[PDB]
PDB file of all heavy atoms in Angstrom:
ATOM      1  N   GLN A   1      -8.562  -8.817  12.341  1.00 53.42           N
ATOM      2  CA  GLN A   1      -9.326  -7.890  11.532  1.00 53.42           C
ATOM      3  C   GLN A   1      -9.113  -6.507  12.090  1.00 53.42           C
ATOM      4  O   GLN A   1      -9.190  -6.301  13.307  1.00 53.42           O
ATOM      5  CB  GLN A   1     -10.777  -8.254  11.548  1.00 53.42           C
ATOM      6  CG  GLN A   1     -11.212  -8.999  10.338  1.00 53.42           C
ATOM      7  CD  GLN A   1     -12.671  -9.369  10.435  1.00 53.42           C
ATOM      8  OE1 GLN A   1     -13.088 -10.059  11.368  1.00 53.42           O
ATOM      9  NE2 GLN A   1     -13.467  -8.891   9.483  1.00 53.42           N
ATOM     10  N   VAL A   2      -8.837  -5.507  11.241  1.00 53.90           N
ATOM     11  CA  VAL A   2      -8.458  -4.174  11.694  1.00 53.90           C
ATOM     12  C   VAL A   2      -9.317  -3.158  10.959  1.00 53.90           C
ATOM     13  O   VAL A   2      -9.414  -3.199   9.715  1.00 53.90           O
ATOM     14  CB  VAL A   2      -6.955  -3.918  11.473  1.00 53.90           C
ATOM     15  CG1 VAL A   2      -6.595  -2.543  12.007  1.00 53.90           C
ATOM     16  CG2 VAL A   2      -6.126  -4.975  12.167  1.00 53.90           C
ATOM     17  N   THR A   3      -9.973  -2.281  11.702  1.00 56.95           N
ATOM     18  CA  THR A   3     -10.654  -1.137  11.136  1.00 56.95           C
ATOM     19  C   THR A   3     -10.113   0.126  11.793  1.00 56.95           C
ATOM     20  O   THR A   3     -10.153   0.263  13.017  1.00 56.95           O
ATOM     21  CB  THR A   3     -12.158  -1.238  11.322  1.00 56.95           C
ATOM     22  OG1 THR A   3     -12.646  -2.400  10.682  1.00 56.95           O
ATOM     23  CG2 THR A   3     -12.808  -0.002  10.700  1.00 56.95           C
ATOM     24  N   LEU A   4      -9.576   1.039  10.980  1.00 55.37           N
ATOM     25  CA  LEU A   4      -9.089   2.322  11.427  1.00 55.37           C
ATOM     26  C   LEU A   4     -10.121   3.398  11.085  1.00 55.37           C
ATOM     27  O   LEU A   4     -10.377   3.626   9.913  1.00 55.37           O
ATOM     28  CB  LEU A   4      -7.743   2.638  10.789  1.00 55.37           C
ATOM     29  CG  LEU A   4      -7.201   4.045  10.982  1.00 55.37           C
ATOM     30  CD1 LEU A   4      -7.046   4.346  12.467  1.00 55.37           C
ATOM     31  CD2 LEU A   4      -5.900   4.265  10.229  1.00 55.37           C
ATOM     32  N   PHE A   5     -10.680   4.007  12.135  1.00 55.05           N
ATOM     33  CA  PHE A   5     -11.568   5.164  11.950  1.00 55.05           C
ATOM     34  C   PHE A   5     -10.775   6.439  12.031  1.00 55.05           C
ATOM     35  O   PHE A   5      -9.977   6.649  12.978  1.00 55.05           O
ATOM     36  CB  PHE A   5     -12.668   5.164  13.011  1.00 55.05           C
ATOM     37  CG  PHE A   5     -13.576   3.951  12.944  1.00 55.05           C
ATOM     38  CD1 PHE A   5     -13.245   2.820  13.640  1.00 55.05           C
ATOM     39  CD2 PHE A   5     -14.726   3.988  12.187  1.00 55.05           C
ATOM     40  CE1 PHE A   5     -14.097   1.716  13.586  1.00 55.05           C
ATOM     41  CE2 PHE A   5     -15.543   2.905  12.123  1.00 55.05           C
ATOM     42  CZ  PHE A   5     -15.225   1.746  12.823  1.00 55.05           C
ATOM     43  N   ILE A   6     -10.931   7.278  11.034  1.00 57.96           N
ATOM     44  CA  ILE A   6     -10.168   8.497  10.838  1.00 57.96           C
ATOM     45  C   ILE A   6     -11.063   9.691  11.011  1.00 57.96           C
ATOM     46  O   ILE A   6     -12.117   9.798  10.353  1.00 57.96           O
ATOM     47  CB  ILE A   6      -9.513   8.506   9.432  1.00 57.96           C
ATOM     48  CG1 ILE A   6      -8.590   7.281   9.295  1.00 57.96           C
ATOM     49  CG2 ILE A   6      -8.775   9.812   9.226  1.00 57.96           C
ATOM     50  CD1 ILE A   6      -8.320   6.954   7.841  1.00 57.96           C
ATOM     51  N   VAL A   7     -10.666  10.599  11.896  1.00 56.34           N
ATOM     52  CA  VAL A   7     -11.314  11.898  12.011  1.00 56.34           C
ATOM     53  C   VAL A   7     -10.339  12.948  11.515  1.00 56.34           C
ATOM     54  O   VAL A   7      -9.183  13.004  12.003  1.00 56.34           O
ATOM     55  CB  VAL A   7     -11.799  12.157  13.436  1.00 56.34           C
ATOM     56  CG1 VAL A   7     -12.601  13.510  13.467  1.00 56.34           C
ATOM     57  CG2 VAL A   7     -12.608  10.995  14.008  1.00 56.34           C
ATOM     58  N   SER A   8     -10.771  13.798  10.592  1.00 54.42           N
ATOM     59  CA  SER A   8      -9.892  14.807  10.008  1.00 54.42           C
ATOM     60  C   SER A   8     -10.550  16.172  10.129  1.00 54.42           C
ATOM     61  O   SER A   8     -11.730  16.310  10.440  1.00 54.42           O
ATOM     62  CB  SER A   8      -9.544  14.505   8.548  1.00 54.42           C
ATOM     63  OG  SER A   8      -9.255  13.120   8.366  1.00 54.42           O
ATOM     64  N   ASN A   9      -9.735  17.205   9.889  1.00 54.81           N
ATOM     65  CA  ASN A   9     -10.164  18.599   9.878  1.00 54.81           C
ATOM     66  C   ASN A   9     -10.652  19.038   8.523  1.00 54.81           C
ATOM     67  O   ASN A   9     -11.464  19.969   8.427  1.00 54.81           O
ATOM     68  CB  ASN A   9      -8.984  19.519  10.326  1.00 54.81           C
ATOM     69  CG  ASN A   9      -7.758  19.297   9.481  1.00 54.81           C
ATOM     70  OD1 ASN A   9      -7.088  18.248   9.547  1.00 54.81           O
ATOM     71  ND2 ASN A   9      -7.421  20.289   8.676  1.00 54.81           N
ATOM     72  N   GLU A  10     -10.160  18.435   7.455  1.00 54.83           N
ATOM     73  CA  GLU A  10     -10.707  18.733   6.122  1.00 54.83           C
ATOM     74  C   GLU A  10     -10.170  17.755   5.109  1.00 54.83           C
ATOM     75  O   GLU A  10      -9.311  16.894   5.412  1.00 54.83           O
ATOM     76  CB  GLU A  10     -10.407  20.194   5.680  1.00 54.83           C
ATOM     77  CG  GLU A  10      -9.030  20.488   5.036  1.00 54.83           C
ATOM     78  CD  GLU A  10      -8.918  21.956   4.631  1.00 54.83           C
ATOM     79  OE1 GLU A  10      -9.401  22.814   5.380  1.00 54.83           O
ATOM     80  OE2 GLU A  10      -8.344  22.262   3.567  1.00 54.83           O
ATOM     81  N   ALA A  11     -10.744  17.788   3.920  1.00 54.12           N
ATOM     82  CA  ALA A  11     -10.334  16.921   2.830  1.00 54.12           C
ATOM     83  C   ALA A  11      -9.079  17.538   2.203  1.00 54.12           C
ATOM     84  O   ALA A  11      -9.015  18.743   1.954  1.00 54.12           O
ATOM     85  CB  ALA A  11     -11.448  16.764   1.790  1.00 54.12           C
ATOM     86  N   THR A  12      -8.059  16.695   1.980  1.00 53.10           N
ATOM     87  CA  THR A  12      -6.889  17.108   1.253  1.00 53.10           C
ATOM     88  C   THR A  12      -6.507  16.024   0.269  1.00 53.10           C
ATOM     89  O   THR A  12      -6.855  14.860   0.439  1.00 53.10           O
ATOM     90  CB  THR A  12      -5.704  17.387   2.197  1.00 53.10           C
ATOM     91  OG1 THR A  12      -5.441  16.151   2.946  1.00 53.10           O
ATOM     92  CG2 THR A  12      -6.015  18.474   3.171  1.00 53.10           C
ATOM     93  N   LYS A  13      -5.772  16.388  -0.785  1.00 52.09           N
ATOM     94  CA  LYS A  13      -5.224  15.411  -1.688  1.00 52.09           C
ATOM     95  C   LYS A  13      -4.258  14.469  -0.979  1.00 52.09           C
ATOM     96  O   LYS A  13      -4.277  13.241  -1.187  1.00 52.09           O
ATOM     97  CB  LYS A  13      -4.548  16.077  -2.877  1.00 52.09           C
ATOM     98  CG  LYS A  13      -5.419  16.427  -4.111  1.00 52.09           C
ATOM     99  CD  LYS A  13      -6.792  15.710  -4.233  1.00 52.09           C
ATOM    100  CE  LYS A  13      -6.717  14.401  -4.951  1.00 52.09           C
ATOM    101  NZ  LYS A  13      -7.994  13.610  -4.877  1.00 52.09           N
ATOM    102  N   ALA A  14      -3.444  15.018  -0.110  1.00 46.80           N
ATOM    103  CA  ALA A  14      -2.482  14.185   0.640  1.00 46.80           C
ATOM    104  C   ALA A  14      -3.205  13.133   1.477  1.00 46.80           C
ATOM    105  O   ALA A  14      -2.776  11.970   1.510  1.00 46.80           O
ATOM    106  CB  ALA A  14      -1.634  15.094   1.559  1.00 46.80           C
ATOM    107  N   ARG A  15      -4.269  13.523   2.156  1.00 46.51           N
ATOM    108  CA  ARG A  15      -4.971  12.515   2.970  1.00 46.51           C
ATOM    109  C   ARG A  15      -5.659  11.485   2.075  1.00 46.51           C
ATOM    110  O   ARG A  15      -5.651  10.284   2.387  1.00 46.51           O
ATOM    111  CB  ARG A  15      -6.020  13.147   3.872  1.00 46.51           C
ATOM    112  CG  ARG A  15      -6.870  12.060   4.558  1.00 46.51           C
ATOM    113  CD  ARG A  15      -7.529  12.551   5.789  1.00 46.51           C
ATOM    114  NE  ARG A  15      -8.558  13.502   5.535  1.00 46.51           N
ATOM    115  CZ  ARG A  15      -9.859  13.223   5.391  1.00 46.51           C
ATOM    116  NH1 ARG A  15     -10.335  12.014   5.465  1.00 46.51           N
ATOM    117  NH2 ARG A  15     -10.690  14.251   5.184  1.00 46.51           N
ATOM    118  N   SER A  16      -6.251  11.909   0.962  1.00 46.54           N
ATOM    119  CA  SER A  16      -6.925  10.971   0.058  1.00 46.54           C
ATOM    120  C   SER A  16      -5.946   9.914  -0.479  1.00 46.54           C
ATOM    121  O   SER A  16      -6.295   8.730  -0.548  1.00 46.54           O
ATOM    122  CB  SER A  16      -7.577  11.727  -1.091  1.00 46.54           C
ATOM    123  OG  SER A  16      -8.675  12.493  -0.640  1.00 46.54           O
ATOM    124  N   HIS A  17      -4.746  10.365  -0.811  1.00 43.36           N
ATOM    125  CA  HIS A  17      -3.756   9.411  -1.338  1.00 43.36           C
ATOM    126  C   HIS A  17      -3.286   8.460  -0.249  1.00 43.36           C
ATOM    127  O   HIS A  17      -3.161   7.266  -0.501  1.00 43.36           O
ATOM    128  CB  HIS A  17      -2.569  10.180  -1.934  1.00 43.36           C
ATOM    129  CG  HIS A  17      -2.913  10.942  -3.193  1.00 43.36           C
ATOM    130  ND1 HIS A  17      -3.908  10.553  -4.036  1.00 43.36           N
ATOM    131  CD2 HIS A  17      -2.420  12.109  -3.677  1.00 43.36           C
ATOM    132  CE1 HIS A  17      -3.978  11.438  -5.039  1.00 43.36           C
ATOM    133  NE2 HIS A  17      -3.099  12.364  -4.846  1.00 43.36           N
ATOM    134  N   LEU A  18      -3.081   8.979   0.954  1.00 42.62           N
ATOM    135  CA  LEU A  18      -2.754   8.095   2.052  1.00 42.62           C
ATOM    136  C   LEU A  18      -3.824   7.084   2.299  1.00 42.62           C
ATOM    137  O   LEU A  18      -3.558   5.877   2.547  1.00 42.62           O
ATOM    138  CB  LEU A  18      -2.542   8.922   3.325  1.00 42.62           C
ATOM    139  CG  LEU A  18      -1.246   9.730   3.484  1.00 42.62           C
ATOM    140  CD1 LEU A  18      -1.362  10.580   4.717  1.00 42.62           C
ATOM    141  CD2 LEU A  18      -0.074   8.783   3.680  1.00 42.62           C
ATOM    142  N   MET A  19      -5.072   7.523   2.335  1.00 41.02           N
ATOM    143  CA  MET A  19      -6.166   6.615   2.580  1.00 41.02           C
ATOM    144  C   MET A  19      -6.331   5.619   1.467  1.00 41.02           C
ATOM    145  O   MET A  19      -6.557   4.485   1.773  1.00 41.02           O
ATOM    146  CB  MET A  19      -7.469   7.361   2.817  1.00 41.02           C
ATOM    147  CG  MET A  19      -7.486   8.102   4.133  1.00 41.02           C
ATOM    148  SD  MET A  19      -8.984   9.055   4.448  1.00 41.02           S
ATOM    149  CE  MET A  19     -10.276   7.824   4.230  1.00 41.02           C
ATOM    150  N   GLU A  20      -6.210   6.061   0.250  1.00 45.34           N
ATOM    151  CA  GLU A  20      -6.440   5.160  -0.835  1.00 45.34           C
ATOM    152  C   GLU A  20      -5.401   4.070  -0.820  1.00 45.34           C
ATOM    153  O   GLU A  20      -5.726   2.925  -1.005  1.00 45.34           O
ATOM    154  CB  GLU A  20      -6.468   5.909  -2.148  1.00 45.34           C
ATOM    155  CG  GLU A  20      -7.700   6.766  -2.360  1.00 45.34           C
ATOM    156  N   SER A  21      -4.150   4.394  -0.528  1.00 44.04           N
ATOM    157  CA  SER A  21      -3.126   3.390  -0.516  1.00 44.04           C
ATOM    158  C   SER A  21      -3.364   2.351   0.570  1.00 44.04           C
ATOM    159  O   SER A  21      -3.247   1.178   0.349  1.00 44.04           O
ATOM    160  CB  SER A  21      -1.776   4.033  -0.245  1.00 44.04           C
ATOM    161  OG  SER A  21      -1.447   4.935  -1.253  1.00 44.04           O
ATOM    162  N   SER A  22      -3.710   2.823   1.760  1.00 44.81           N
ATOM    163  CA  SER A  22      -3.940   1.956   2.871  1.00 44.81           C
ATOM    164  C   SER A  22      -5.121   1.053   2.770  1.00 44.81           C
ATOM    165  O   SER A  22      -5.124  -0.020   3.332  1.00 44.81           O
ATOM    166  CB  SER A  22      -3.956   2.755   4.185  1.00 44.81           C
ATOM    167  OG  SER A  22      -2.702   3.400   4.374  1.00 44.81           O
ATOM    168  N   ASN A  23      -6.188   1.512   2.145  1.00 43.23           N
ATOM    169  CA  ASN A  23      -7.436   0.781   2.105  1.00 43.23           C
ATOM    170  C   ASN A  23      -7.302  -0.397   1.123  1.00 43.23           C
ATOM    171  O   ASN A  23      -8.186  -1.231   1.025  1.00 43.23           O
ATOM    172  CB  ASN A  23      -8.655   1.667   1.767  1.00 43.23           C
ATOM    173  CG  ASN A  23      -9.983   1.113   2.254  1.00 43.23           C
ATOM    174  OD1 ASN A  23     -10.090   0.500   3.304  1.00 43.23           O
ATOM    175  ND2 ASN A  23     -11.022   1.340   1.473  1.00 43.23           N
ATOM    176  N   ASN A  24      -6.208  -0.394   0.326  1.00 43.60           N
ATOM    177  CA  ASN A  24      -5.861  -1.488  -0.547  1.00 43.60           C
ATOM    178  C   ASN A  24      -4.758  -2.414  -0.046  1.00 43.60           C
ATOM    179  O   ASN A  24      -4.340  -3.286  -0.723  1.00 43.60           O
ATOM    180  CB  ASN A  24      -5.390  -0.950  -1.894  1.00 43.60           C
ATOM    181  CG  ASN A  24      -6.494  -0.398  -2.734  1.00 43.60           C
ATOM    182  OD1 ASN A  24      -7.679  -0.452  -2.365  1.00 43.60           O
ATOM    183  ND2 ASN A  24      -6.152   0.201  -3.854  1.00 43.60           N
ATOM    184  N   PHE A  25      -4.236  -2.134   1.128  1.00 48.31           N
ATOM    185  CA  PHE A  25      -3.109  -2.849   1.656  1.00 48.31           C
ATOM    186  C   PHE A  25      -3.337  -4.289   1.963  1.00 48.31           C
ATOM    187  O   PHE A  25      -2.488  -5.116   1.665  1.00 48.31           O
ATOM    188  CB  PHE A  25      -2.611  -2.146   2.893  1.00 48.31           C
ATOM    189  CG  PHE A  25      -1.451  -2.836   3.574  1.00 48.31           C
ATOM    190  CD1 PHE A  25      -0.194  -2.714   3.092  1.00 48.31           C
ATOM    191  CD2 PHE A  25      -1.650  -3.559   4.716  1.00 48.31           C
ATOM    192  CE1 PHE A  25       0.872  -3.341   3.720  1.00 48.31           C
ATOM    193  CE2 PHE A  25      -0.595  -4.154   5.385  1.00 48.31           C
ATOM    194  CZ  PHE A  25       0.648  -4.032   4.874  1.00 48.31           C
ATOM    195  N   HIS A  26      -4.468  -4.591   2.540  1.00 49.31           N
ATOM    196  CA  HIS A  26      -4.712  -5.941   3.026  1.00 49.31           C
ATOM    197  C   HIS A  26      -6.262  -6.164   3.015  1.00 49.31           C
ATOM    198  O   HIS A  26      -6.977  -5.223   3.235  1.00 49.31           O
ATOM    199  CB  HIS A  26      -4.168  -6.083   4.439  1.00 49.31           C
ATOM    200  CG  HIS A  26      -4.180  -7.493   4.945  1.00 49.31           C
ATOM    201  ND1 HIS A  26      -5.309  -8.166   5.264  1.00 49.31           N
ATOM    202  CD2 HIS A  26      -3.159  -8.329   5.252  1.00 49.31           C
ATOM    203  CE1 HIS A  26      -5.020  -9.375   5.716  1.00 49.31           C
ATOM    204  NE2 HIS A  26      -3.705  -9.495   5.725  1.00 49.31           N
ATOM    205  N   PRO A  27      -6.725  -7.381   2.768  1.00 46.78           N
ATOM    206  CA  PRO A  27      -8.190  -7.596   2.782  1.00 46.78           C
ATOM    207  C   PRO A  27      -8.819  -7.305   4.125  1.00 46.78           C
ATOM    208  O   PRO A  27      -9.978  -6.879   4.224  1.00 46.78           O
ATOM    209  CB  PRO A  27      -8.321  -9.076   2.445  1.00 46.78           C
ATOM    210  CG  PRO A  27      -7.113  -9.392   1.639  1.00 46.78           C
ATOM    211  CD  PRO A  27      -6.061  -8.624   2.369  1.00 46.78           C
ATOM    212  N   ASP A  28      -8.104  -7.654   5.192  1.00 45.50           N
ATOM    213  CA  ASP A  28      -8.619  -7.565   6.531  1.00 45.50           C
ATOM    214  C   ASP A  28      -8.295  -6.259   7.221  1.00 45.50           C
ATOM    215  O   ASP A  28      -8.471  -6.148   8.438  1.00 45.50           O
ATOM    216  CB  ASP A  28      -8.086  -8.746   7.359  1.00 45.50           C
ATOM    217  CG  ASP A  28      -8.597 -10.103   6.813  1.00 45.50           C
ATOM    218  OD1 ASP A  28      -9.625 -10.124   6.143  1.00 45.50           O
ATOM    219  OD2 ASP A  28      -7.887 -11.140   7.027  1.00 45.50           O
ATOM    220  N   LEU A  29      -7.873  -5.238   6.461  1.00 47.00           N
ATOM    221  CA  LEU A  29      -7.662  -3.894   6.945  1.00 47.00           C
ATOM    222  C   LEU A  29      -8.610  -2.978   6.239  1.00 47.00           C
ATOM    223  O   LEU A  29      -8.586  -2.853   5.012  1.00 47.00           O
ATOM    224  CB  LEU A  29      -6.214  -3.376   6.754  1.00 47.00           C
ATOM    225  CG  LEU A  29      -6.047  -1.869   7.004  1.00 47.00           C
ATOM    226  CD1 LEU A  29      -6.426  -1.435   8.395  1.00 47.00           C
ATOM    227  CD2 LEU A  29      -4.583  -1.497   6.777  1.00 47.00           C
ATOM    228  N   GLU A  30      -9.422  -2.237   7.018  1.00 48.22           N
ATOM    229  CA  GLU A  30     -10.412  -1.331   6.495  1.00 48.22           C
ATOM    230  C   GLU A  30     -10.224   0.044   7.073  1.00 48.22           C
ATOM    231  O   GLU A  30     -10.019   0.155   8.270  1.00 48.22           O
ATOM    232  CB  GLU A  30     -11.834  -1.853   6.812  1.00 48.22           C
ATOM    233  CG  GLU A  30     -12.943  -0.944   6.385  1.00 48.22           C
ATOM    234  CD  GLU A  30     -14.287  -1.442   6.817  1.00 48.22           C
ATOM    235  OE1 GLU A  30     -14.361  -2.267   7.748  1.00 48.22           O
ATOM    236  OE2 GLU A  30     -15.276  -1.016   6.189  1.00 48.22           O
ATOM    237  N   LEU A  31     -10.389   1.065   6.231  1.00 50.22           N
ATOM    238  CA  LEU A  31     -10.399   2.464   6.671  1.00 50.22           C
ATOM    239  C   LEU A  31     -11.807   2.997   6.571  1.00 50.22           C
ATOM    240  O   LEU A  31     -12.489   2.759   5.574  1.00 50.22           O
ATOM    241  CB  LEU A  31      -9.469   3.306   5.824  1.00 50.22           C
ATOM    242  CG  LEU A  31      -8.003   3.291   6.302  1.00 50.22           C
ATOM    243  CD1 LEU A  31      -7.446   1.889   6.471  1.00 50.22           C
ATOM    244  CD2 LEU A  31      -7.191   4.061   5.267  1.00 50.22           C
ATOM    245  N   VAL A  32     -12.230   3.771   7.583  1.00 48.15           N
ATOM    246  CA  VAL A  32     -13.523   4.400   7.612  1.00 48.15           C
ATOM    247  C   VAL A  32     -13.330   5.879   7.966  1.00 48.15           C
ATOM    248  O   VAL A  32     -12.705   6.189   8.984  1.00 48.15           O
ATOM    249  CB  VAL A  32     -14.464   3.757   8.662  1.00 48.15           C
ATOM    250  CG1 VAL A  32     -15.824   4.497   8.742  1.00 48.15           C
ATOM    251  CG2 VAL A  32     -14.673   2.301   8.290  1.00 48.15           C
ATOM    252  N   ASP A  33     -13.868   6.765   7.140  1.00 46.03           N
ATOM    253  CA  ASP A  33     -13.782   8.200   7.336  1.00 46.03           C
ATOM    254  C   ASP A  33     -14.927   8.640   8.244  1.00 46.03           C
ATOM    255  O   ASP A  33     -16.071   8.713   7.804  1.00 46.03           O
ATOM    256  CB  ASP A  33     -13.805   8.958   6.006  1.00 46.03           C
ATOM    257  CG  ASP A  33     -13.388  10.393   6.170  1.00 46.03           C
ATOM    258  OD1 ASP A  33     -13.289  10.897   7.294  1.00 46.03           O
ATOM    259  OD2 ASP A  33     -13.146  11.052   5.136  1.00 46.03           O
ATOM    260  N   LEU A  34     -14.598   8.981   9.480  1.00 47.84           N
ATOM    261  CA  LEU A  34     -15.597   9.487  10.423  1.00 47.84           C
ATOM    262  C   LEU A  34     -15.605  10.990  10.528  1.00 47.84           C
ATOM    263  O   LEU A  34     -16.134  11.554  11.503  1.00 47.84           O
ATOM    264  CB  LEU A  34     -15.392   8.911  11.805  1.00 47.84           C
ATOM    265  CG  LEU A  34     -15.893   7.551  12.242  1.00 47.84           C
ATOM    266  CD1 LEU A  34     -15.803   7.481  13.767  1.00 47.84           C
ATOM    267  CD2 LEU A  34     -17.266   7.240  11.744  1.00 47.84           C
ATOM    268  N   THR A  35     -15.013  11.695   9.587  1.00 49.33           N
ATOM    269  CA  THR A  35     -14.942  13.170   9.710  1.00 49.33           C
ATOM    270  C   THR A  35     -16.364  13.712   9.715  1.00 49.33           C
ATOM    271  O   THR A  35     -17.097  13.515   8.760  1.00 49.33           O
ATOM    272  CB  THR A  35     -14.116  13.784   8.549  1.00 49.33           C
ATOM    273  OG1 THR A  35     -12.769  13.278   8.541  1.00 49.33           O
ATOM    274  CG2 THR A  35     -14.121  15.287   8.690  1.00 49.33           C
ATOM    275  N   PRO A  36     -16.773  14.417  10.767  1.00 47.72           N
ATOM    276  CA  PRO A  36     -18.150  14.935  10.786  1.00 47.72           C
ATOM    277  C   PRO A  36     -18.367  15.953   9.667  1.00 47.72           C
ATOM    278  O   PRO A  36     -17.483  16.676   9.265  1.00 47.72           O
ATOM    279  CB  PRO A  36     -18.272  15.600  12.199  1.00 47.72           C
ATOM    280  CG  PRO A  36     -16.880  15.665  12.732  1.00 47.72           C
ATOM    281  CD  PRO A  36     -16.022  14.654  12.014  1.00 47.72           C
ATOM    282  N   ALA A  37     -19.617  15.999   9.162  1.00 50.70           N
ATOM    283  CA  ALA A  37     -19.924  16.764   7.973  1.00 50.70           C
ATOM    284  C   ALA A  37     -20.112  18.247   8.198  1.00 50.70           C
ATOM    285  O   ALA A  37     -20.113  18.996   7.213  1.00 50.70           O
ATOM    286  CB  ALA A  37     -21.178  16.184   7.318  1.00 50.70           C
ATOM    287  N   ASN A  38     -20.243  18.714   9.460  1.00 50.07           N
ATOM    288  CA  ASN A  38     -20.488  20.160   9.677  1.00 50.07           C
ATOM    289  C   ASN A  38     -19.429  20.821  10.558  1.00 50.07           C
ATOM    290  O   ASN A  38     -19.740  21.321  11.634  1.00 50.07           O
ATOM    291  CB  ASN A  38     -21.915  20.340  10.272  1.00 50.07           C
TER     292      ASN A  38
END
């Protein structure tokens, strides 16, 4: 089981597309956006 926590500097279309693709790759692979809100 794999969970990738991602910290980013800001929201981008490129990152959203990367994330969206990956979060559908496998049932046992999960992406979590930990980018702090402030």
Side-chain angles (χ1 to χ4, degrees), residues 1-19 21-37:
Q1 260 178 301
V2 183
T3 300
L4 170 57
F5 298 90
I6 299 160
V7 185
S8 317
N9 55 291
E10 83 178 39
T12 58
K13 272 342 271 170
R15 172 159 68 95
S16 290
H17 292 330
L18 284 172
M19 289 179 53
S21 299
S22 298
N23 204 36
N24 287 355
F25 177 77
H26 190 291
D28 297 336
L29 169 58
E30 177 183 21
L31 276 52
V32 177
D33 193 348
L34 278 194
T35 300

